[PDB]
Amino acid sequence: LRNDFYRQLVGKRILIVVNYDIDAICASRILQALFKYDHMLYTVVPIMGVTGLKRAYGEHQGDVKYVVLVNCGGCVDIVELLQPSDDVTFFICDSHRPLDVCNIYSDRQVCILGDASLEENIPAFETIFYDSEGEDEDEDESSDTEQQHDDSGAGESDQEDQAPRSRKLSRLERHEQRILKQRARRQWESERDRIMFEYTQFSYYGRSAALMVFELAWKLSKDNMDLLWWAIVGITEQLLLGKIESGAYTLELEQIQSHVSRLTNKTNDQNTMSASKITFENDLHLVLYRHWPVTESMRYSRYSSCQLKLWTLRGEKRLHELLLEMGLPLVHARQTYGAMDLVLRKEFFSMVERLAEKYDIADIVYGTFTLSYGYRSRYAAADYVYALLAIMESVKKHKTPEDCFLEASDALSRQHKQLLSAGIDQAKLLHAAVFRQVQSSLEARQVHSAGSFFYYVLQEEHAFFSYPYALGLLARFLLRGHVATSRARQASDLPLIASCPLNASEGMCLLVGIVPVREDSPRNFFGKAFEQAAQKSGVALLQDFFEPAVVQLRQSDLTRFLDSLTV
Amino acid sequence: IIPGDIPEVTFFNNYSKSLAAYMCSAGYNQGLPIDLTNNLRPPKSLYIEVRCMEDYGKFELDDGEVIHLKKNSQHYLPRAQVESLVRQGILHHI
């Protein structure tokens, strides 16, 4: 809580705007407003990894006491990181769930926004940072160390019955004096059945970046309805169960309903031009449903493509034969929905909810929003994150990537929209350059069993996919095709690998991988799994990214690495 | 603060001495080289860093560690430093 600490927020600070994300700029660009509200001058930062972290703060070495932590924290006992932390406060609103308690405890310059269903790490700092064996933090027979040292009385301290602390078992003797180590490893390790089961099994994330910030500012008599749309960007970034597990998807159908079915600054005069009060609507999260013809969707939909095999023609025979039950035209089924005749686009959605009942794809419809600025338009709630990431363009001019991070922050203004359609120049063509090796894949059958998973690697770059995140998508695009449709469950469901050719960046074998179908809540051991081969051997490995699921090799230090990675 | 990135210097020094008249009455009876072209900022806390838009010439002689005056001329630079320029490639940001 900071209803009290926000009262403190006057003196100098840094609002770093945390590592690569949608949600950051959503949950920060709000705050360039609030700072000019309370008359605060500011400074904000691009982060791509721990590289950026001190390479810049080493340039900003003050004692600036009010400091942020979002999308970060699972990196260092960050006093170990920022040793110039003496009393310089940090601020926690991070979504990275698995973090170390060393930054929770020693709670000098950190603030716990803590409420959760995990009472499993209670003394984990009281032993882990407290114990050791073959330990020197003790007295000795020598007359030099017969003084009050940091007598931790622990697995740090003596094993000759000179130690105040360690009331856990007997100190005179259990069966001998030296059984202290035995119980120390027992107590150390027997919980590492759970502790090292934490942080060495998988990784996943928490919650929002500005939902609290809405509620923080909800008290401030602030009906900045615009900011709600800024908010939902971060919501449907990863509340979407199509990407990341929410559950609260179906339980904030109450809350934000309880927000905005409640919150109505105009019950009487809301039907006019600028930013009419919003709606919730039961809609899709379909592949860019609105602005281009159906025949873009009916191919480019994974939820169609998962169940129907549409890269080939039987899908299309299945397609149109299901358009029998609608009896849609075809010319109209190849122009933009918004451009079609009108009773069709109007009437269209109403029947699809019901006459998708029988054709294996019933779960295309979800809950969403929709609103505008004026009368040029009706932008769409879900139709916004995807044009953004066309500006996350992996140009190697050395100027674009940092600077285009700034353009994003200039993007979500009402004033700045000419740029915005440029994404749509870029986005769709990506989305159908998607197939550009897929049907070359499913028929080449470039899926590799590779033991206890499924496995793929690409060996030729895309200027598109130099940029990293689509690597996950293509991985998420195909195993449905052959691996999930021509098989039984025993021979189908296993996770996958997805390599990234850096045909330009000197050769370093970038990669991501993902779980099998219908195993989502089974969080990915890939949170650690790639440490398997690396922990054993490791060869020039990197974890320079903030992300867990992310790596970087050499051109040729991947196969024997992968051979170690068999397990 | 920032002369040209590259007997005119004698005329510039004469113009600088001629501008003194303005400076004398400006700011007070006694005189202040008066801020006319920067910090419509309400002044906030004095020690936070900078950002630019590819400035060039590199004349920032103002009280900082090292700024390297272009975009990301950014170091722990106080208020005394950052009093230089506005629209020569700088003020996307503070």
Added chain:
Amino acid sequence: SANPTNIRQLKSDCVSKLVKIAGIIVAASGISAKATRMSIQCLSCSTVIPNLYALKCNTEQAGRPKCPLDPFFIMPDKCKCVDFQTLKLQELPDFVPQGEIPRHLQLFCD
């Protein structure tokens, strides 16, 4: 002025309907003449026309005399005036103009 069409699909079904299509121009006429209205000695009323037949005499009411069978002698110095070109174009070069022959359209500039 959004989204185009072709020519090998358009008939009674889509008649009196406004469409976007594309080809490559061939040649056409110059600009001659048109008008909308003027009037005549016979009645001295403006030549009110809807579209861009030929009529009672009305040089009659001089007592009895009639003069039917249309003595309507236009006085064009009373008139109005518009333009024309009458244009023409050929359909696409990619939609089987080879095994078939190219069809086309006749047009009206204003």
Added chain:
Amino acid sequence: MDPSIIEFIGEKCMISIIPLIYGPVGPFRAGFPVFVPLWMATHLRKQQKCRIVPPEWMDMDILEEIKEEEKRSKFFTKMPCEHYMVVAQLVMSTAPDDVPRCEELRTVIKDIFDIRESKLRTSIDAFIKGEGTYAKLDNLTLLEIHSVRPILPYSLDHIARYQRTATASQRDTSMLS
């Protein structure tokens, strides 16, 4: 001549509003109107602090009567505080956050703003023969004449070499410039 020469000026005027600094302004009290210059409602409404209602000319009746009143104005017209091209700029920016009828408002103002200039060519299409000492402000507004201020007067001198020269400068029988 500017966008903000007016905003140097016109916001200096004051009106009673809804919510001590020295000035004729009184201290501020909840529920209690307060006449203020208009460069605080900036710092209240955008600060999400209070509302404001307009002057009286701001209506769709008094000036939906003026729509015909100024047809007298072969010269000029009724001028409700002369500044309804500036305040309405800022009012209609933020006032309609809760204010009603921000439209015929927006209609008429352009339906009177562009028009009284549309005459202005016409009356200026009457200037003949260096007619320097005939002019018109007779019930002029505030925010118009800047839009011709730089153009013709930085023309007419290079005309008035020959126009205004007559009534103190002479030559032989032909005219002098």
